[PDB]
Design a protein around this ligand. Structure first.
Ligand SMILES: O=C(O)Cc1cc(O)ccc1Nc1c(Cl)cccc1Cl
Ligand SMILES: O=C(O)Cc1cc(O)ccc1Nc1c(Cl)cccc1Cl
Ligand SMILES: O=C(O)Cc1cc(O)ccc1Nc1c(Cl)cccc1Cl
Ligand SMILES: O=C(O)Cc1cc(O)ccc1Nc1c(Cl)cccc1Cl
Ligand SMILES: O=C(O)Cc1cc(O)ccc1Nc1c(Cl)cccc1Cl
Ligand SMILES: O=C(O)Cc1cc(O)ccc1Nc1c(Cl)cccc1Cl
Ligand SMILES: O=C(O)Cc1cc(O)ccc1Nc1c(Cl)cccc1Cl
Ligand SMILES: O=C(O)Cc1cc(O)ccc1Nc1c(Cl)cccc1Cl
Ligand SMILES: O=C(O)Cc1cc(O)ccc1Nc1c(Cl)cccc1Cl
Ligand SMILES: O=C(O)Cc1cc(O)ccc1Nc1c(Cl)cccc1Cl
Ligand SMILES: O=C(O)Cc1cc(O)ccc1Nc1c(Cl)cccc1Cl
Ligand SMILES: O=C(O)Cc1cc(O)ccc1Nc1c(Cl)cccc1Cl
Ligand code: NA
Ligand code: NA
Lengths: 131, 132, 128, 126, 127, 127, 126, 128, 125, 130, 132, 130, 131, 125
C-alpha cells in the first residue's frame, strides 16, 4: 500500500510532465533537486531552471500523438519518509512520415517527505533523450 | 549535515575501492541482497540482486594484469532523514587499452543507501555512460 | 476430441485476427485478458502488460495477410497455444508492393467458458 | 498464484541450467517429443521435435539471468512463462559482453510431470 | 514426344500471356486451385492457393517477357515440367529501360484432358 | 495416395542422405543422367547432367539438414513433385554454429519401376 | 583488303545510324531473322531473333563514334568487324558525358546483300 | 550439310578449348591466325591483335569448365562463328568453391583447308 | 573562502553580460590586452577585444550556467576560476538544445575592481 | 622589473615542460600545487583536482620528439601570481618514420607560494598526450 | 627562336580563344582534318578527326549562359626545324558550377603543329586532368 | 623611422583587405602591380600572374562577415620594399545562422614603386574565398 | 616505311626503359626534353634528372614478370626531320597474391632528328602511373 | 633581369643546404628573426630557427627541384622568389615518390650578402 502511494505520487509527477505543467512540477520537486539526464551531456544539474527551459520550449510537439508506458516499477522503501523508484519508460510516438515509433529510457527517481509532502530530490535518466 | 554527508561519502568510497580491488567479498557486505541496478552492461534492463555483478568481479576485475585508476568527481549528497541517503557523482576511469595506451572513460553514477540495523546498505544504483 | 479442439482454437484465433484487421479495438479488448502480456518489436525487447500499449496501434494505423500452416498445442481442456508464420503484402509510400514476415505465438485460456487471449510473442518487423 | 508460479519458475530454471551444461539428455527428458520452436537459429521457421536443437548441445564461461518472469497459469496442467534472458559471456578477444533475448516457454503438466511443448525466442542468436 | 513438348510450350506461353496482360481470370483457369509456389515475394515460404498472387494482379504498361530456351521433362502422358530463364524488359520509375532475369520451374498436370499448373518455383528478382 | 506420398518422402530423403554423406555414387543412382538444375551455384543458368554437381561432392564434417514440411504433388502413378524448405546447420570457418535456409523443388519420374530425379530448383544460399 | 573492308564499314555504319534514328524497320531489313546477341541488356544470356531489341527501338541529342575498326574477311560472303564505340550524350542534368562499349558484329553476304547475324557487346548498357 | 558443318565447328572449337585447358600455348598458336584480334576483360576495353598478349596468361596461370548450349552461324563454306556461355567452377585462396560466368564469341576462318581462329570476344570476369 | 564568493559574483556578471549581448559591460570588465583561447579562434591565441565583437553583435532565449566552479586565490590581487558552462539554446526549429564548454578565466584586481586578463574555453563554439 | 618576472615565468614554465617531456613526475609534483586543477582532453571535459590523475599518464607513457613553445603571453598579476598562454607544437615521428606535427593550446597559472613558484591550474585543448 | 616560338604561342593562343568562344569554325580552320587527340572525354582512346570535339562546341561551348575564363601557364615550346613545333603547358579554367560558385580546374596540354602550305595546322593534342 | 614604416605597411595592407571584403576590384587593381604573382588554393598549386584570374573571383562573388588580421609580422627591406605575414581569421554565418570560422595564412609582398605602394606577390594557404 | 622507322626508334626507347638502361635512354633523348606524366603531379618537368631517379630506384621490381604491349600506334610526319607518335600502352603484371593484372596508359612522344639522329624531345603520359 | 640570376643562385644554395641536412649553412643564410608559414607548423606563423631544426636532424636520396621560378626585384636590397618545388624521395619500401609544394621566399641584401627573412610553403610537408 505504501509502495502504491509512491506509484501514485510518481505518476502525478509524470502527469505534470505530460501536460507541460511546470507549476505542478515545481511544487512537487525540492528546489535543490539534482538530475542526470542525456540533455545535460553527462553533468549533474541542480535546481529547476534547467528543466523549466524544456517545459517552455516544446510547444512544437503538442497535438503530436504520444503515449508513455511505465513498465514494472521497482520501489525501495527506506523508513517512513524516504523512497526510491526505478522503471523503464517506453514512449510511442509518430515520426515525420506518420509512422509509429518507440523509444526507451530508464528512470530512477528519489522521493523524500519534507513537511508532510513527498518531494522529488533526484532523478537519473538514461537511454533515449526526452528531446 | 556537514559530517553526516561525510559519512555517506566515505561509505560510498569504500564501495568504489572494493570495485577497484575486485573485492567481491567487501562488495557483498556493503550491498543489500535485494539491490537493483540500471547500467550499460544490463542493456537497458533492471537487474536485481548481486549475481549479475559477480560475473564482472570474477572474470574481469580479478585480473590485475594492468593497473587502473578510478576517480569520484564532486559528489552531491541528498539526505532523507537519518536512515536514508542518495549520492550522485561523475566517475572517471583511467586504464590501459589493448595496445597498452592510457585511456579514460566517464560514467555518471547514482547510488542509494539505507541504514539498516546500524549499517549502511547499498539498495539501488543507476549508471550511465561508459560500460566497465 | 483433440482435432475438434484444435479447430476450435483456430477459429477463436481467427476471430481475434478479424478484430485486428478491422481496427476493432473494442472487440480486441473483449477477447484479451486484461492482464495479457506481449513481446513484440514495437516494445523494444520489453514485456508489456495489459492493453493500453496496443491501443496506440489501433488508432494510428491496400493490404493482404497470409497465415501459413499453424501449429496448435493443447494443454488441458481450457488452454492452448497456436504458432504460425504471417506474410503481409502491402504497398509502401512509393506505391511499390512489398512483403514482410512475422512469427507469432498466441496463448489462449478459457476462463469461465470464454476463451481469453493472455500472451502473445511476435518476432520480425513492426506491424504495417 | 505464488505456489504454482514458483513451480513453473523452478522447472524453467532447470531447463535453462540443462542448456548451459550442454546436457541434451536432461533437456530431452524435460521436453515433449513433439515440441515446437520459433528462434533466430531457425531463420523465421517453426521447427518441430528435438533433433534440430541437438546440433547446439553437441557443438558448444557464461552466466544466464532470467529477469522478472511473468507466469500465466491456465488450469492445473498449463502454464506460460515469459522473461527477458541476459547472457553474460566472454568473446574470443576476452572482452566481456552481454546479450539479450526474449523467451516465451509453454509448459504442460502431463500425468504429474511438467513438459516443455513450445518456445518462442527473439533477439540474440545463441 | 516431339509433338507434345510443343503443347507444353503453348500452355505455358498462354499462362505467361495471362500474366503479362494482368488477366487473373485466364491465369486462374490455367492453375489448379491448390498450386504451390516458391518465389522471392514469399520470402522463402511455400505459398498455397491463388490469393497470394492475386495481390500482384490487382496492383500492377510497356512490359515485354522473353522466355529463353525452355527445357521440358515429359513424365508420361499426364505430367510435364518446364524450366526456362525469363528476361523482363520494363520501364522503371524514371522511364529508363531496364531488364531483370528470373529462373522459373513450372510443373503441369493434365486433369480431365486439360493442363493445370500445379507448382511453380521462381528465383531471381521480385515482380 | 496417402501411402504413395510416403514413398516420395523416402526416395527424396535417401537423396538427401547421399548428399549429406558426400556419396556421389548413390546420388547418381537416384538421378536421371539428363536431370536439369537451377541453383545459386549455376548463376541463373540451367545446368544439364551430373558433371556440375560432381564438383561439390569432390570438394566438400558436422552438418545437419532439416527438411521442413514437404508438399508433394502426385500427377499419376509415375510422377511426383516435392517442395520443401531445408535448414542446414553447419560449423563455419571459426567453428561457430551457423544456419542457412534454402527452398528446393525436386521432380521425380518413375522409369521401369524406380524413381529417378529429373529436375531440381534450389533458391537461397550456395552450398 | 581495302575494298571489301570499306564495304563492311559502310554497312555497319548504316546499321549504327539506323540504331541512332530508332529506325527498327531499317534495322530489321539489315538483320537476319535468326541473329543472336550478347549484350549487357541481356544479362549474360544469348538472345535470338529481333523481338528482344524492339523494346529499345520503341522506347527511346547523341553522337556515336566508331574507332579504328578491325575487319576480318573470310571468303566472299563473310566478314567480322570489331570496334570501340564511344557514345557522346547529355544526361538529365545536362552535363555532357561519354560512354564506351566494345562491339563485335558478324556479317554474311546472302545472295548479294549483307546480313547481320551475330553481335557481341560489352561495356556500357545503352 | 549445315548440321554436319556445325558439328565440324563445334569440334574445331573444342580442340582450341583443349589447348587452353592444358596450358598448351604451342597448340593454341597453331590454331589461331597470327593476326587474330580479341576483346576481353584483361584488355581493359581495348582490341588486342596477335598472340603475344595471350602468352602471359598461359605462362602465369582444381577447376572445371561447363560450356552451355552453343549457337553456330555458318557464313559460307570457310567461315563460322560460335557463341556460348561458359561456367567455371574453381576454389579461391580460402579453399571456398566458387563459380564465374563468361560469354564468348569465337570467329573461325578455314584458310587453305585449315580452320584458323581469327577473332574472339569474351565478356564477364577475368580468366581464373 | 570569502574572496571566492567575490570571484563567483564578478564572473557571474561577466556571464550575464555575455548572455545579454552587452558588449560594453563586457569591455568594462576586460583588460584591453586580454588574451583568449577559444574554439571560435581555432588554434590561435587572440589578443584584444576586436575579435569578440562579432559574437555579441550576431548572437531567442539563451541560458548560460556555471557548474561547480573551482576558484584559485593567488595572493590578494589575482584569482583563477574554472568551471563547466552549460548553455541551453534553441536550434533552428525552436527545439531546446544543450552545449557544454570548459572555461578558465583569470582575473586581476586593480584599484578595487576586478579586470579579466585571460580566458581559455574548450569544447563547443 | 616586470621584464625580469616574465623571463622568470618562462624559465619556470620551460622547466615544467622539460619535466613533462621526461616523464619525471618527481619534479612535476614539486613544481605543482597539490590542489591544482586541470582541464585537458584526457579528462573528457571534466575538471580534475590533484596529481593522482596525472601520475597515471606519467607512469604509463614512455622516437625523437620535439616540443616548441610558440608565442607565449605572460600576464603578471601583482608579484605572487602569473598566467602564461602559449601554443605547444609537437614534432615527432610515427610508426614508419614519417614526420608528424600536433598542436595544443595551453594555459598555465602560477602562484608564488612560500617563495617557490607553484602550478595551481592548467587548461589544455587540442592534441592529447597520446 | 626568340620570335619563331612567339609565332607558335600566338597560333596556339588563337586556338584556345576559339575553344573559349565556342567558335568551331575558327577551330576547324586551325586544325588538320586528320588530327588526333588523347583527352579525358575520350575515356583513354585516341580519336581521329574533328567530329568528336564538334559535339562539345555544339551542345556545351555554344551556351554562353555563364562567363568562363581559361589561362595558359608558362608555355614550353619545342621547334623541330622550320615546319614543325610542339607546345606544352598547363591550362587553368575558371567557371561557375551548378550553384553559381566560381571554381577552378587544371589540365595539362600538349599540342603539336605542322606548317603545311604556309599555314600552321594542329595535328595532335594530348590533354590530362580535368574534363571540360 | 622603421616604426612609422610598419604602421604605413599595416595601413596599406588593411586598405587592400578592405577592398577585398568589398569586391572593389577597382582599388585592388590600383594597389597591385600588373605583374603580380599569386599562390592561393583557388589556383590549385600553380603560380598565377596578372589580375585577370583574380577579377573572375571579384566579379562572381557577392550575411555579415568579419575578417580579423592576427599577429602581423612586417619585414622591412630597405625603404622600397616590405613583406607582411599574418593569419586572416574569417567569422561569418552559414546557411542557418550558425557561426563559422575559417582561417588562412597570408604573405603579402609590397614594393614602393613610383612612390606608391604596390602589391607584387601574395601567398595564401588554408581556407579559400568560397 | 618512314612511319616504320619511327616505330623502330620509338620501340628502341621502350626497350631501353624495359631494361632500365638509362644510358640508352639518355643519349636517345635531347637533354632539354620535357615531360607530362602522372609521377610529376601535373607539372612539366625538363631535363633527364627527374627520370634518372625512377631508373635507379625500381630494382625491387626486377624479376617480377611484366609485359608491355603497344596498341595501334598513330604517327604524324611533319617534314623529313620531325615526327609525333601516339599509342595506348597496356602493361600485364602480377599483384601481391600472384594474380595477373593489367594497367593502361596513353603516350604521346615527339621525335626530332638533330645532327642526323632521332632525338626524343617531349613525352605526354596519362592513365595508370608507371609506378 | 641580371639580378634574377643572383637570386636563383642564392636560393639554389639554400635548396642544396636543405637537401643535405646542412643546418649550419642554412642558418648562415637566414635572418635570426625570420618568419615561416609551412604545413609542418600547421596554421602558425613560426619565428626564429629553433622550429626548423627538427627536420634537418631527422631527415636515402632526396632531390629538391625548382620549377620555373618567378623573381620580383624590389629596389636593390630586396627580392621575392616564388616557384613550385618538386621533391623526389623514396618511401618505406624504397619506391620512388614525388611530392609538390609551392614556396615563397623573401630575401634581404645586407652588406653584399643575401639573408632569408621570410618563407611561405603550402602543399606537402
Ligand atoms: O523527466 C523529467 O523529470 C522532467 C524533464 C526534465 C528535463 O530537463 C527535460 C525533460 C523532462 N521531461 C520531458 C520528457 Cl521525459 C519528455 C518530453 C518532454 C519533457 Cl519536458
Ligand atoms: O497482434 C495483436 O495482438 C494486436 C497488435 C498489438 C500491437 O502492439 C501492435 C500491432 C497489433 N496488431 C496489428 C498487426 Cl499484427 C498488423 C497491423 C496492425 C495491427 Cl494493430
Ligand atoms: O533454448 C533452448 O530450448 C535450447 C536451444 C535450442 C536451440 O535450437 C538453440 C539453442 C538452444 N539453447 C542455447 C542457448 Cl539459448 C545458448 C547457448 C547454447 C544453447 Cl544449446
Ligand atoms: O508468375 C506467376 O505465375 C504469376 C505471379 C505470381 C506472383 O505471386 C507474383 C507475380 C506473378 N507474375 C508477374 C510477373 Cl512474373 C511479372 C510482373 C507481374 C506479375 Cl503479376
Ligand atoms: O542438391 C543436390 O541435389 C546436390 C548438389 C548439387 C550441387 O550442384 C551442389 C550442391 C549439392 N548438394 C549439397 C548441399 Cl544441398 C549442401 C552441401 C553440399 C552439397 Cl554437395
Ligand atoms: O546494337 C544493336 O544492334 C541494336 C540494339 C539492340 C539492343 O537489344 C539494345 C540496344 C541496341 N542499340 C542501341 C544502342 Cl547501342 C544505344 C541506344 C539505343 C539503342 Cl536501340
Ligand atoms: O581464350 C583464349 O583464346 C585464350 C586466352 C587468352 C587470354 O588473353 C586470356 C585467357 C585465355 N584463356 C584462358 C581461359 Cl578462357 C581460362 C583460363 C586460362 C586461360 Cl589462358
Ligand atoms: O566568452 C567570452 O569571454 C566572450 C566571447 C568571446 C568570443 O570571441 C566569442 C564568444 C564569447 N562569449 C559567448 C559565449 Cl561564451 C556564448 C554565447 C555567446 C557569446 Cl558572445
Ligand atoms: O601537461 C601537464 O601539465 C601534465 C600532464 C597531465 C596529464 O594528465 C596528461 C599529460 C600531461 N603532460 C604530457 C604531455 Cl602535455 C605530453 C606528453 C606526456 C605528458 Cl605526461
Ligand atoms: O586575396 C587577394 O589578394 C585577392 C583574391 C584573389 C583571388 O584570386 C581570389 C580571392 C581573393 N580575395 C578574396 C578573399 Cl581572400 C576572400 C573573399 C573574396 C575574395 Cl575576392
Ligand atoms: O616513360 C618514360 O618515358 C620513361 C620514364 C620516365 C619517368 O619519369 C618515370 C618512368 C619512366 N618509364 C618507366 C615505365 Cl613507363 C614503367 C616502369 C618503369 C619506368 Cl622507369
Ligand atoms: O624550407 C626551409 O626553409 C627549411 C625547412 C624548415 C622546416 O621547418 C621544415 C623543413 C624545411 N626544409 C625541408 C624541406 Cl623544404 C624538404 C625536406 C626537408 C627539409 Cl628539412
Ligand atoms: Na510483395
Ligand atoms: Na561454386
Amino acid at each position: 500500500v505504501r509502495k502504491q502511494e509512491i506509484i501514485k505520487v510518481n505518476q502525478q509527477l509524470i502527469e505534470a510532465i505530460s501536460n507541460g505543467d511546470f507549476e505542478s512540477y515545481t511544487k512537487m520537486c525540492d528546489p535543490g533537486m539534482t538530475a542526470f539526464e542525456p540533455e545535460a551531456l553527462g553533468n549533474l544539474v541542480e535546481g529547476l531552471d534547467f528543466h523549466r527551459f524544456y517545459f517552455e520550449n516544446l510547444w512544437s510537439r503538442n497535438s503530436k500523438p504520444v503515449h508513455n508506458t511505465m513498465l514494472n516499477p521497482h520501489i525501495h522503501l527506506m523508513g517512513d519518509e524516504s523512497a526510491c523508484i526505478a522503471y523503464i519508460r517506453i514512449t510511442q510516438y509518430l515520426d515525420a512520415g506518420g509512422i509509429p515509433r518507440t523509444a526507451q529510457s530508464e528512470e530512477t527517481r528519489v522521493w523524500h517527505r519534507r513537511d508532510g509532502k513527498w518531494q522529488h530530490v533526484h532523478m537519473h535518466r538514461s537511454g533515449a533523450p526526452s528531446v
